[PDB]
Enzyme design. Structure first.
Site, PDB file in Angstrom:
ATOM      1  N   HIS A  29       0.817  -1.206   0.000  1.00 40.29           N
ATOM      2  CA  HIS A  29       0.000   0.000   0.000  1.00 40.29           C
ATOM      3  C   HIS A  29       0.859   1.269   0.000  1.00 40.29           C
ATOM      4  O   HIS A  29       0.338   2.394  -0.041  1.00 40.29           O
ATOM      5  CB  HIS A  29      -1.028  -0.003   1.154  1.00 40.29           C
ATOM      6  N   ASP A  53      -0.134  -7.546   1.312  1.00 43.93           N
ATOM      7  CA  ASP A  53       0.225  -6.126   1.427  1.00 43.93           C
ATOM      8  C   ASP A  53       1.758  -6.061   1.542  1.00 43.93           C
ATOM      9  O   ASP A  53       2.309  -5.150   2.162  1.00 43.93           O
ATOM     10  CB  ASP A  53      -0.446  -5.498   2.658  1.00 43.93           C
ATOM     11  N   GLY A 109       4.568   7.264   8.651  1.00 46.16           N
ATOM     12  CA  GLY A 109       5.724   6.991   7.817  1.00 46.16           C
ATOM     13  C   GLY A 109       6.602   5.830   8.245  1.00 46.16           C
ATOM     14  O   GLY A 109       7.661   5.609   7.653  1.00 46.16           O
ATOM     15  N   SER A 111       5.425   2.605   8.365  1.00 49.83           N
ATOM     16  CA  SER A 111       4.911   1.357   7.818  1.00 49.83           C
ATOM     17  C   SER A 111       5.991   0.764   6.956  1.00 49.83           C
ATOM     18  O   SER A 111       6.578   1.457   6.141  1.00 49.83           O
ATOM     19  CB  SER A 111       3.666   1.616   6.983  1.00 49.83           C
TER      20      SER A 111
END
Ligand code: ZN
Ligand code: ZN
Lengths: 151, 16, 180, 22
Positions: A29, A53, A109, A111
């Site tokens: 993502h 993901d 920020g 992830s």
């Protein structure tokens, strides 16, 4: 000096990438099907798993690989893009609770970053902050096993 | 588009 | 906080040899674990409560090269396989464990921390067996509990077909007893 | 005979850090 965690960006946003087993893993993502920059031109994803993901390109320049966890500890430590360490208690395969809730911005920020066990080994990749009225009280993550399986 | 590396983090805090 | 470690080489072969004979070492000290060596072999020395401990089967009864010349050992215990010199000006000391945890983490000569499950006063099992070479040069190194306190010092691996599956360590209690 | 010499170190006290550019 080599780093296990890369701080990456797209025109849109910034997030992290974690090098494990010679692969530079991050959140789909965040990177999508995007190729990564290289001194010799864009290098394409070695793995793309939308369902998980998860995406990964070959480990970049100036990086070292993190070792997967093998002790099965539930005391995790999330590393943010600002190099902060946040204790997280594993509640399940892909979820853990921050021992101390933080404003959503604190985890912004991060992830793609790693969730380390007491030995500094990778338990999983930070997927998403689970928030309640702007306060992230827990997190979603991609178990290293998934990475290990994707390979 | 293309992902770009803007920085790096060393978990051990190893100085240069 | 997760246990992470990093190594740094401070000198080389020839510089080591000269310093061995000279007994005078002016290099600046940093760290909790000093990578140490004789003309024969390399091992680790761990600073705990102001004393730089190591394994006797490595250090023998030798002095340690310091900026002021050779330094005589403070403690020596051939049976417990221990020797201790006053910690070098500059090193940081660990402190004994006070949580009786059985989940230990061994720090290797290459600054790799591996998990070991305590299986007795002086033994733990590698949750992930590794070839003995990975452990080569790690005697004298620390076995930390989850909080980073010294539980023991790695003494010898317990290998079979060349694969280390467990490790024998000197529990930090033998240290208190050696000083007694 | 012959002193034990420090040829390196292992630092446990370092915390995760963003590598500086220089
Ligand atoms: Zn682990
Ligand atoms: Zn303890």
């Amino acid at each position: 000096v080599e780093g296990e965690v890369q701080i990456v960006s797209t025109a849109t946003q910034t997030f992290l990438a974690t090098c494990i087993n010679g692969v530079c893993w991050t959140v789909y993502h965040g990177a999508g099907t995007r190729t990564i920059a290289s001194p010799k031109g864009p290098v394409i994803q070695m793995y793309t798993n939308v369902d998980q993901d998860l995406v990964g390109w070959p480990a970049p320049q100036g990086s070292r690989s993190l070792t997967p966890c093998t002790c099965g500890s539930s005391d995790l430590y999330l590393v943010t893009r600002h190099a902060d360490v946040i204790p997280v208690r594993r509640r399940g395969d892909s979820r853990g609770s921050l021992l101390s809730p933080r404003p959503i911005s604190y985890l912004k920020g991060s992830s793609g970053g790693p969730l380390l066990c007491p030995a500094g080994h990778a338990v999983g990749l930070f997927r998403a902050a689970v928030c309640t009225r702007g306060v992230a009280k827990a997190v979603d993550f991609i178990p290293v096993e998934n990475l290990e399986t994707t390979m | 588009g293309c992902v770009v590396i803007v920085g790096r983090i060393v978990l051990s805090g190893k100085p240069a």
